[PDB]
Curated annotation (Swiss-Prot):
This is Ribonuclease HI. It comes from Escherichia coli (strain K12). Belongs to the RNase H family. Changing residue 48 to Q: Loss of activity. Disruption phenotype: In a strain that encodes a retron, the msDNA is abnormally sized. Its EC number is 3.1.26.4. NCBIfam families: PRK00203.1. Its cofactor is Mg(2+). HAMAP family: RNase_H (MF_00042). Keywords: Cytoplasm, Endonuclease, Hydrolase, Magnesium, Metal-binding, Nuclease. One of its GO terms (biological process) is DNA replication, removal of RNA primer. GO terms for cellular component: cytoplasm.
Length: 155
């Protein structure tokens, strides 16, 4: 039994906007849970974020997590953006809502419930788990069955 929750995530999109999907593997309690869904019209950035959201919202209790992902998008947000966006009420320099605020807020809400350690990996050098996430993400993108109601073109 592992003493830390381990999450692996990836997302993929066939357009901008186009069919996308995500794959996330969660090692928790003593089980390995795999999550994957496809959206008819979305973006690659929204799928990377959606993959982390889904895994984290699957945790019912406060946990110690290690999230491994190659998303530059998540990495940039976690490390350079989110802290300053919160100070600014989630507005850009020109006072408009930040792009994908819906998902960033939803991620934020999940983050604050656990003790997380982020593992930024190189796509070309991932764990077999990262590689499976991509497979899942790809498959999902060829069979979308959900609507990304949050997706906008505007902001």
């Amino acid at each position: 039994m592992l003493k830390q929750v381990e999450i692996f995530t990836d997302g993929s999109c066939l357009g901008n906007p186009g069919p996308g999907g995500y794959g996330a593997i969660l090692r928790y309690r003593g089980r390995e849970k795999t999550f994957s869904a496809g959206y008819t019209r979305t973006t690659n950035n929204r799928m990377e974020l959606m993959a982390a959201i889904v895994a984290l919202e699957a945790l019912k209790e406060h946990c110690e997590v290690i999230l491994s992902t190659d998303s530059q998008y998540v990495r940039q947000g976690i490390t350079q953006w989110i802290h300053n966006w919160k100070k600014r009420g989630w507005k850009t320099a020109d006072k408009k809502p930040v792009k994908n605020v819906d998902l960033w807020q939803r991620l934020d809400a999940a983050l604050g419930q656990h003790q997380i350690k982020w593992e930024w990996v190189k796509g070309h050098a991932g764990h077999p788990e990262n590689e499976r996430c991509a497979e899942l993400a790809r498959a999902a993108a060829m069979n979308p069955t959900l609507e990304d109601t949050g997706y906008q073109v505007e902001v």
